[PDB]
Design a protein around this ligand. Structure first.
Ligand code: A1CDN
Ligand code: A1CDN
Length: 330
């Protein structure tokens, strides 16, 4: 089997991407944030504290003839920004782009933190990291991809995020029309439960490529590109007036600037992020200071190849017995 679903930016900045997912019988369609940096499929639901729902579409398990409470199971998760959610668990039928999993753990939110409430466009998350990170207790649950894998034509999914435009998540096959050149594959460590890999270096604009190993994670659920302070300083030094602002929380730059591109290495291959992808717009409405899309990882403890990087590539998440990642230009 295979599946194919369109993923759409939630706003004009590509702050996140939502993909429609069918849950239950009859189907209830929710728009979920596919997150290769976590491993829980959780949704706003009829159980979510009412004051914490503000426009999201909710899953109502009582209206699904295939929903079954997973007795005794609870979940609770905290994300990189300090946001969080928690609740109980059902199993139900879940379909993505024509690919159906029965008995998928659907984690029903009883509580969500303010950043989730305030984003009416995201009805939940669909985790695509390794199932060892799933937070369900006392019986850990498998991700949608893990549950589908044996049925797929090939044990893979691909992320093809758009720049200010829709893109695609495919399950079970590699669309050879979706990229240019060849896909370069690189080793993955699953020891932290992430799609963790080592980039071979970087270049800023038309500058020379610096060969240096940068370990990081391929994370569709993080907006920006977080890299070591040395790398990020080298990038923003090429932008007149750019500076790191503690009050804003990162590098900012004059909105009048034209940003240089940023290249990262995948083995001997190179992925080029155009400068426009690094512009995240005014820090507040009407400001002439703009927020940068490349930021320091120094406070985070890990480098993160988020959407800014991933959207410049066609990305293969290969879930074979020995997982690997593939990147192609497009
Ligand atoms: C602080 O941010 C982190 C840190 C570790 C792992 C992840 C994130 C975001 N998604 C996965
Ligand atoms: C992984 O996705 C995350 C992570 C943290 C906070 C938020 C999202 C989506 N909107 C708020």
């Amino acid at each position: 089997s295979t599946g194919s679903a369109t993923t759409t930016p939630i706003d004009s900045l590509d702050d996140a991407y939502i993909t429609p997912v069918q849950i239950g019988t009859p189907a209830q369609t929710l728009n979920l944030d596919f997150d290769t940096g976590s491993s829980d499929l959780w949704v706003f639901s009829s159980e979510t504290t009412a004051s914490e729902v503000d426009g999201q579409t909710i899953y109502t398990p009582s209206k699904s003839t295939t929903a079954k409470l997973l007795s005794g199971a609870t979940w609770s998760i905290s994300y990189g920004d300090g946001s969080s959610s928690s609740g109980d668990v059902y199993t139900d039928t879940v379909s993505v782009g024509g690919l159906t999993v029965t008995g998928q753990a659907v984690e029903s939110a009883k509580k969500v933190s303010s950043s989730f409430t305030e984003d009416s466009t995201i009805d939940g998350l669909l985790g695509l990291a390794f199932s060892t990170l799933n937070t369900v207790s006392p019986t850990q649950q498998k991700t949608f991809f893990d549950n589908a894998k044996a049925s797929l034509d090939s044990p893979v999914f691909t992320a093809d995020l758009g720049y200010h435009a829709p893109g695609t998540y495919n399950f079970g096959f590699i669309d050879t029309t979706a990229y240019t050149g060849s896909i370069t594959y690189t080793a993955v460590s699953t020891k932290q439960g992430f799609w963790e890999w080592t980039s071979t270096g970087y270049a800023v604009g038309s500058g020379t490529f610096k060969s240096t190993s940068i370990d990081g994670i391929a994370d569709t659920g993080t907006t920006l590109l977080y890299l070591p302070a040395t790398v990020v300083s080298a990038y923003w030094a090429q932008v007149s007036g750019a500076k790191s602002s503690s009050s804003v929380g990162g590098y900012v730059f004059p909105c009048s600037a034209t940003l240089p591109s940023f290249t990262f290495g995948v083995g001997s291959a190179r992925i080029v992020i155009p400068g426009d992808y690094i512009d995240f717009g005014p820090i507040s409405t009407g400001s002439s200071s703009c927020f940068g899309g490349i930021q320091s990882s120094a406070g985070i403890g890990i480098n993160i190849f988020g959407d800014v990087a991933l959207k410049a590539a066609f990305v293969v998440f290969n879930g074979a017995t020995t997982p690997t990642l593939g990147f192609a230009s497009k």
